[PDB]
């Protein structure tokens, strides 16, 4: 139904928007657009502890 | 390009084989009578929206 999809010569961004496959190095935004029960995207692993703590402590002191 | 024409062709082949078995000349054959009349019929359900249905 999309004009960009009906156009005979598809752009690279248009072909990227069709990367709904749950795969390594896929369209992460187009895979996040679908619900959490549909896409297997867990929570973002944020590294906490002394490694960021001492850094921000120096930068704030 | 007609289904009826194909059916009549099959019937013509069968009738020609029968006439040759009877002994008639193939090159002098001629369709003297061709006619069709209704035969057996079958029904098929036609489910329609809003809880309706008919029978094809």
């Amino acid at each position: 139904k999309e004009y960009r999809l009906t156009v005979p010569y598809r752009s690279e961004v248009t072909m990227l928007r069709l990367a709904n496959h749950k795969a390594i190095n896929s369209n992460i935004r187009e895979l996040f657009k679908k619900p959490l029960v549909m896409n297997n995207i867990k929570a973002i692993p944020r590294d906490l502890g002394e490694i960021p703590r001492d850094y921000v402590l120096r930068l704030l002191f | 390009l007609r289904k009826g024409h194909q059916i009549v062709f099959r019937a013509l082949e069968m009738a020609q084989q029968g006439a040759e078995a009877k002994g008639l000349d193939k090159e002098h054959l001629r369709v003297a009578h061709i006619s069709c009349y209704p035969g057996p019929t079958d029904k098929q359900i036609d489910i329609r929206s809003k809880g309706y249905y008919a029978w094809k």
Partner: protein
């Protein structure tokens, strides 16, 4: 609507799997690229240990003290080991109702891909393009 870019460009600072690579809970070598059984958490830092992001095994991304999963998939580094927030804050050990000895996390930085470093990295990199020199 998601408000984060896709296919993060690493032309300013490429994020590649190093040839030598050990774990944080285990300090044992991991597979480089043949199997994604490891967990990559990149942040674009050469801060020790394991620069440009540390690594964890899927089975061992759990807390090292209570040997349980993570609450919000966020671990706490404690003197070289990864602890959980209830362990780091000093609270009592809470047994989760869901999976016990493994956490919900994707493989090969897939879960940490939507956040981090993107293009452009610095401000002086855009003016390099828009200037003729």
């Amino acid at each position: 609507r998601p408000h984060f870019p896709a296919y993060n460009e690493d032309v300013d600072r490429p994020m590649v799997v190093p040839p030598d690579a050990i774990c944080f809970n285990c300090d044992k070598p991991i597979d480089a690229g043949d199997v994604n059984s490891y967990v990559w958490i990149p942040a674009g830092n050469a801060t020790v240990p394991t620069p440009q992001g540390y690594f964890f095994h899927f089975g061992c991304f759990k807390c090292n003290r209570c040997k349980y999963r993570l609450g919000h998939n966020k671990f706490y580094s404690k003197d070289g080991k990864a602890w959980c927030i209830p362990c780091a804050l000093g609270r009592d050990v809470r047994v989760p109702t869901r999976r016990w000895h493994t956490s919900y996390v994707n493989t090969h930085r897939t879960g940490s891909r939507l956040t981090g470093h993107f293009f452009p990295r610095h401000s002086h990199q855009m003016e390099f393009l828009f200037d003729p020199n």
